[PDB]
């Protein structure tokens, strides 16, 4: 049975084609003491003796020796398979460098000896999982945010927007403003505690200025969080100020337009004839789109930017942390996908550049 591996800046999502969910989800980290190395959940717990490295940054693989360790860990420790037995669908970021696609292909065939493989674009898989062939995906993870317009099954490369503001930046900012509130979150161990606060307590305000005034004239927007040591801390307007950064990147000294503006800019780089279908099919995917209120806020913000007669629809599936993986699971399972794999034989005859002809 085919394997599906969705490698992210922060998390690896791995499983079997035909399952409704990944079997394994773990941090894309390699830890070394300074046993040579530890990968994933093992590296997290042993951080007292380990220095941690992330092989993927902003969606792009930049450390290929550590990435091989991630993949070995996926095959042997998590999925517990013999790689040589299983066709392997991998995912890539939009606009992933051509040499990266080739390197990925080379490693799979030459290091792991897979019988077949395929590389799919993450945002496109997410659109498929939503039961659409046309739309614009807002994919936001731990390391990167993209706007990816897609028409009749294929991304429009010229109109893709990249934003190097995502979950890790939000976590760092929450650390800063919680520090300002009197607490001390600065170390890497403490980063993960603040990430949990972010995931449990943060939300996107429908109207930001109104929310600030509510938090200033009430305490009903305040929440408590129990630290590991037992200390109960309070979170006030930081709850919505953190993710507001997505809409106002100036909050962290960035000159970039916020996610609503990049969405509009992306749509506007497309043919006027398809924009209507883009506006009606805004699909959110990735962990950083999980904030309560984000879909309603995006609806409001894009409505304000679009022509007043445009039908705007934000689709935010509850399962959208795994949408990319699920799309891959469906794709790999289709009776019509059997001929679409790059086989080991095809790789032997053509070399790594086959990926550019077999995988859009």
């Amino acid at each position: 049975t085919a394997l599906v591996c969705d490698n992210g800046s922060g998390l690896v999502k791995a499983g079997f084609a035909g399952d409704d969910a990944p079997r394994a989800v773990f941090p894309s980290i390699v830890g070394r003491p300074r046993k040579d190395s530890y990968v994933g959940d093992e590296a997290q717990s042993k951080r007292g003796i380990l220095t941690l490295k992330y092989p993927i940054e902003h969606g792009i693989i930049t450390n290929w020796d550590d990435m091989e360790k991630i993949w070995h860990h996926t095959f042997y420790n998590e999925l517990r398979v013999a790689p040589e037995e299983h066709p392997t669908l991998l995912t890539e970021a939009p606009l992933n460098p051509k040499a990266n696609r080739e390197k990925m292909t080379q490693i799979m065939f030459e290091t792991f000896n897979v019988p077949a493989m395929y590389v799919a674009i993450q945002a496109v898989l997410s659109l498929y999982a939503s039961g659409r062939t046309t739309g614009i995906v807002l994919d936001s993870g731990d390391g990167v945010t993209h706007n990816v317009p897609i028409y009749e099954g294929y991304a429009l490369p010229h109109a893709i927007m990249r934003l190097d503001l995502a979950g890790r930046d939000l976590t760092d900012y929450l650390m800063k403003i919680l520090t300002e509130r009197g607490y001390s979150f600065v170390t890497t161990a403490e980063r993960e505690i603040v990430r949990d606060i972010k995931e449990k307590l943060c939300y996107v305000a429908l109207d930001f200025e109104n929310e600030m005034a509510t938090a200033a004239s009430s305490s009903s927007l305040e929440k408590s969080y129990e630290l590991p040591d037992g200390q109960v801390i309070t979170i006030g307007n930081e709850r919505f100020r953190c993710p507001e950064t997505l809409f106002q990147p100036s909050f962290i000294g960035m000159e970039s337009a916020g996610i609503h503006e990049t969405t509009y800019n992306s749509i506007m780089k497309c043919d006027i004839d398809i924009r209507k279908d883009l506006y009606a099919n805004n699909v959110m995917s990735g962990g950083t789109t999980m904030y309560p209120g984000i879909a309603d806020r995006m609806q409001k913000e894009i409505t304000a930017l679009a022509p007043s007669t445009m039908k705007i629809k934000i689709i935010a599936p509850p399962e959208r942390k795994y949408s990319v993986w699920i799309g891959g699971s469906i794709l790999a399972s289709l009776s019509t996908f059997q001929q679409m794999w790059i086989t080991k034989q095809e790789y032997d005859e053509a070399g790594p550049s086959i990926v550019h002809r077999k995988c859009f």
Binding site: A24, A189, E192, P228
Partner: peptide, 11 residues
């Protein structure tokens, strides 16, 4: 059954 293997550090 998905196992998300990402535990938080203790004191």
């Amino acid at each position: 059954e998905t196992n998300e293997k990402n535990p938080l550090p203790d004191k």
